[PDB]
């Protein structure tokens, strides 16, 4: 029982550290996709603005 306790404790601690470090590791793809999304939503709003401006000016000419 004591031997199994030792080995399982070592394995659990090592794997917990492994998980902690790995989750600390993965932060790049998420940030790059977030920047892409933010700029592309900026484009979305810009094109909405252009749509509204075109509608307004064309209606004024009408």
């Amino acid at each position: 029982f004591k031997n199994e306790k030792d080995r399982l404790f070592s394995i659990t601690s090592d794997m917990t550290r492994q998980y902690k470090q790995m989750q600390d590791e993965l932060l790049n793809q998420v940030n790059d996709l977030n920047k892409t999304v933010i700029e592309k939503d900026e484009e979305i709003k810009k094109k909405d603005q252009q749509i509204q401006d075109m509608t307004k000016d064309y209606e004024y000419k009408l």
């Binding site: 031997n3 199994e4 030792d6 080995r7 070592s10």
Partner: protein, 49 residues
């Protein structure tokens, strides 16, 4: 199974080795004691040799 079990296990093993060495010395110098009984005891193979 326990890689570090040897490092911490210093007092008990050293004490047992001291006990066996004292047993050897006593048996060597024992000029009268010739009857012994260790049955039903926990005696290791290394101590036996």
């Amino acid at each position: 199974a326990n890689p570090n079990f040897f490092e911490t296990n210093k007092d008990a093993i050293e004490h047992n080795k001291q006990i066996i060495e004292n047993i050897c010395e006593v048996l060597k110098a024992a000029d009268t004691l010739l009857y012994y009984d260790f049955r039903f005891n926990n005696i290791s193979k290394t101590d036996a040799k």
